[PDB]
TrEMBL record, chain A:
Family stated for the protein in its record: Belongs to the FlgI family.
Gene this protein is translated from: flgI
Transmembrane segments: none
Coiled-coil residue windows: none
Protein name from the UniProt record: Flagellar P-ring protein
Record note on quaternary structure: The basal body constitutes a major portion of the flagellar organelle and consists of four rings (L,P,S, and M) mounted on a central rod.
Cited function: Assembles around the rod to form the L-ring and probably protects the motor/basal body from shearing forces during rotation.
Subcellular location: Bacterial flagellum basal body
Lineage: Bacteria, Pseudomonadati, Pseudomonadota, Gammaproteobacteria, Enterobacterales
Species for this entry: Salmonella typhimurium
Residues of the full protein shown: 20 to 61 of 365
From TrEMBL, chain B:
Subunit structure: The basal body constitutes a major portion of the flagellar organelle and consists of five rings (E,L,P,S, and M) mounted on a central rod. The rod consists of about 26 subunits of FlgG in the distal portion, and FlgB, FlgC and FlgF are thought to build up the proximal portion of the rod with about 6 subunits each.
Gene assigned in the entry: flgF
Organism: Salmonella typhimurium
Signal peptide (from-to): none
Keywords for this protein: Bacterial flagellum, Cell projection, Cilium, Flagellum
Membership in a protein family: Belongs to the flagella basal body rod proteins family.
Species lineage: Bacteria, Pseudomonadati, Pseudomonadota, Gammaproteobacteria, Enterobacterales
Protein name per its UniProtKB record: Flagellar basal-body rod protein FlgF
Any one annotated GO CC term: bacterial-type flagellum basal body, rod
GO biological-process terms attached to the record: bacterial-type flagellum-dependent swarming motility
Domain called Flagellar hook protein FlgE/F/G-like D1: residue spans: 1-44
Residues in coiled coil: none
Primary location group: other
Span covered, complete protein: 102 to 201 of 251
Compartment list: Bacterial flagellum basal body
Automatic annotation (TrEMBL), chains C, F:
All residue ranges annotated as the Flagellar basal-body/hook protein C-terminal domain in the record: 216-260
Protein name: Flagellar basal-body rod protein FlgG
PANTHER family reported in the protein's UniProt record: FLAGELLAR BASAL-BODY ROD PROTEIN FLGG (PTHR30435:SF19), FLAGELLAR PROTEIN (PTHR30435)
SUPFAM superfamilies per the UniProt record, alphabetical: Flagellar hook protein flgE
Sorted UniProt keywords: Bacterial flagellum, Cell projection, Cilium, Flagellum
Pfam families listed in its UniProt record: Flg_bb_rod, Flg_bbr_C, LlgE_F_G_D1
Domain Flagellar hook protein FlgE/F/G-like D1: 96-159
TrEMBL record, chain D:
Residue stretches making up the Flagellar basal body rod protein N-terminal domain: 6-34
Gene expressing this chain: flgG
Lineage: Bacteria, Pseudomonadati, Pseudomonadota, Gammaproteobacteria, Enterobacterales
Protein name: Flagellar basal-body rod protein FlgG
Matches recorded under SUPFAM superfamilies: Flagellar hook protein flgE (SSF117143)
Presence of keyword ATP-binding: no
Listed Pfam families: Flg_bb_rod, Flg_bbr_C, LlgE_F_G_D1
Gene Ontology biological process terms, A to Z: bacterial-type flagellum-dependent swarming motility
Subunit structure: The basal body constitutes a major portion of the flagellar organelle and consists of four rings (L,P,S, and M) mounted on a central rod. The rod consists of about 26 subunits of FlgG in the distal portion, and FlgB, FlgC and FlgF are thought to build up the proximal portion of the rod with about 6 subunits each.
Ranges of residues in domain Flagellar basal-body/hook protein C-terminal: 205-249
Domain Flagellar hook protein FlgE/F/G-like D1: 85-148
Length: 42, 100, 260, 249, 52, 260
């Protein structure tokens, strides 16, 4: 077995990024703005 | 004669000397509840099982041959005239156009 | 004879059972504590002629095969155990029930029945008995001198003596609840008996454990909705009309069969 | 002879049609009954080869199917808290004594000695819903959430869910009696779902569905059945007299 | 039986409940603190034949 | 069977649907916001035998060809969207609509329905619901420290608090208009839903953009002309009698035929 397949380097590391956004189009099927106030506000 | 019968052992017999379809004699499960489809496929159901278990169990071979090429043979059974045998062979094809 | 005639027979018998139940409801207005009955119907055998499965070609399916079907066998009669209306009897001895519960009663055989009828009395011994002499459970022996009888919403029955100005309690009158009231087997006399569909009878004081309250000086009326009965009875007459027409059509068909 | 058998098949078809009509009309006042219509069908035709190059004689009026009208019936107010009716499609699943499942559209529900919700004959509905012992009142919402009130607990304790099933082909279900249908090869698999979603219908409490039998249609169909039966019997009689005159010589 | 008869049956029941409410209010005059009652009605299913 | 019997069947069915509509209108008196219905009928096929053109000579033309025809298919039922008569319910939580418009409501399924009722309540959370818990749109939330609800004719709903002497505004209640009101698909609960015959909703404040005004303390009654429904009932009964008479005549004709 290769060292890379069972070991990770100390300096090499992943991070998690999160964000909020809007999706346009969708041929309908979008959020119900009445029940989703944040969509209209954004 | 389409007055088909099923023996106690599951043998499908227009009056004994039984029937031929897609192989040798047609044999069906003992708990018959048999139905014959429009083009001959024989489907069966055990009487004490859900109705969605009626997969086909056999096929009823049917043959097209008429008049000048058919001859009575001392029983209620016809055969080929020995002139329609230097032709379509001794054992005839199933003719997938004969309905039931 | 003919498949149609047996089916029309079932139709006539079922509509007659409807009329029977309606008439029994209708007659028992002004029967205190009476509970409405309503028939539940049910179709009989269906003679399968072609199976709804039963593949038709090597690929097709034969949807919705042939089956004829007979009969309208009446399967049950539910009894509506809703709260009936009250009425002022102004009788110190009559008690109605606020909600669930039953009065237990001891029959002459020693078995126990259950009644929602507050038309109580006192016999020559001072026991509460119910219009037929049935001695209720638990026993309550009114003293011979008693002037006033009161029955609280919690059921503690207490009498007032002459001179002694303290309403000494004389007994406790508690209710019995079943976890399926509909399954009790009525035996007349406004009395139901326990059957193994109703469940074991659980005795409790009124108000507690889900039982109802007690209202003295009132009687609970039959919960028969008369307008529903009249419209139902119109329906039953017309249904019987229709089924009789079916019998007549079958008869005429069988006529011109014989005349043939 | 030939005409005798042709007219006999005619008589059989009208007799079958009358059996269907009688089953429809007898089962008026059956909750959730679906009326049947029989589709008839002519038999094989016989060709005569002319030396258009052929004519057809024909025979028979075979009954090929009976289909149920799975339409919404009216509502009858039962004043009973246990009875329910369905707006739209769907069936209640019940578990037979054998163990398999049937489907019913009849809402005349009850409770047995153990609290289970059974259907006028003791078949437990699915999923099991056990009403507690001293529930002052039972409520069944429009999406099927069945709950009860208790002795002072000022909120309905939840007791269960009243699911339904939708089928691809409702007319294909095989009816077995007791107002019960059973799944077949032609109905497809039962798509379980909650009411109000995935095509299933909503629930009404205190109401029971009625049989959608239109007695006007059935009475006029009786008129047709009787007259057609008499006409076919006349054809039979005429053929018999023809054969009489034939055998006289 | 007939759809007309079922619809009219529901109508009779509704009017009966309305009259029950009115009679209860009427009887409960001179009752301290009693609050009047008002019945709100609501039509049942609409069985569609041709979709709108 | 007979070309006449099928036609008479269609006539009977048409009159039965007419009586169904009449009975539904009639029973729904005293239902707020209800709109009277009226069934519209429509003749079926015509079996042409001689074409109305198709000259008989090179000069003649054969006017008014032979056509028999069948059926009375009921094509539709329209709903009359006219203003009902306001009734002074004097209730602070009831609001009627003068003119066009609808109240939008969130069904539990997440879809939007529309009602012409003002019999509104306020549930335990203070939300504005409609006689069955259906949360109206936009969301209107009554604060706990409110005393009296007022709703302007322009939809501005505002509350009064304890101690604070000011009518603080708490929400806006705007109507929905459709350009084919008749095309809404009713689903019971006094609610309609959008279809692609009514068209897309147009949401706007009351008064503006052709909407109506809000009358607080009022309820809009059903616009069912009772005398019209009674006379329609007379007419429909007689029409049904006559079509059944046609069925009887056809039946007797057939019976005399079979006797032959």
């Amino acid at each position: 077995e290769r060292i890379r397949d069972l070991t990770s380097v100390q300096g090499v590391r992943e991070n998690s990024l999160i964000g909020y956004g809007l999706v346009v189009g969708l041929d309908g099927t979008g959020d119900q703005t009445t029940q989703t106030p944040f969509t209209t506000q954004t | 004669n389409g007055n088909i019968q099923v023996g106690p052992t599951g043998q499908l017999t227009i009056q004994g000397h039984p029937v031929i379809g897609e192989g040798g004699p047609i044999t069906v499960p003992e708990g018959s509840e048999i139905t014959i489809a429009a083009d001959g496929t024989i489907s069966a159901l055990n009487p004490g099982d859900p109705p969605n278990t009626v997969a086909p169990v056999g096929r009823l071979k049917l043959v097209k041959a008429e008049g000048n090429e058919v001859q009575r043979s001392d029983d209620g059974l016809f055969r080929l005239t020995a002139e329609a045998q230097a032709e379509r062979g001794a054992v005839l094809a199933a003719d997938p156009s004969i309905r039931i | 004879m003919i498949s149609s005639l047996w089916i029309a027979k079932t139709g006539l018998d079922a509509q007659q059972t409807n009329m029977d139940v309606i008439a029994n409801n209708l007659a028992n207005v002004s029967t205190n504590g009476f509970k409405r009955q309503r028939a539940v119907f049910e179709d009989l055998l269906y003679q399968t002629i072609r199976q709804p499965g039963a593949q038709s070609s090597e690929q097709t399916t034969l949807p919705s095969g042939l089956q004829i079907g007979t009969g309208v066998r009446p399967v049950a009669t539910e009894r509506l155990h809703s709260q009936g209306n009250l009425s002022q009897t102004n009788n110190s001895k009559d008690v109605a029930i606020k909600g669930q519960g039953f009065f237990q009663v001891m029959l002459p055989d020693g078995t126990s029945a259950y009644t929602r009828d507050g038309s109580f009395q006192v016999d020559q011994n001072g026991q509460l008995v119910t219009a037929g002499g049935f001695q209720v459970q638990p026993a309550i022996t009114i003293p011979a001198n008693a002037l006033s009888i009161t029955i609280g919403r919690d059921g503690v029955v207490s009498v007032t003596q002459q001179g002694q100005a303290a309403p000494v309690q004389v007994g406790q009158l508690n209710l019995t609840t079943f976890m399926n009231d509909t399954g009790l087997e009525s035996i007349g006399e406004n009395l139901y008996i326990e059957t193994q569909s109703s469940g074991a009878p659980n005795e409790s004081t009124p108000g507690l454990n889900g039982a109802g309250l007690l209202y003295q000086g009132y009687v609970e009326t039959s919960n028969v909705n008369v307008a529903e009965e009249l419209v139902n009875m119109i329906q039953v007459q017309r249904a019987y009309e229709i089924n009789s027409k079916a019998v007549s059509t079958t008869d005429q068909m069988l006529q011109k069969l014989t005349q043939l």
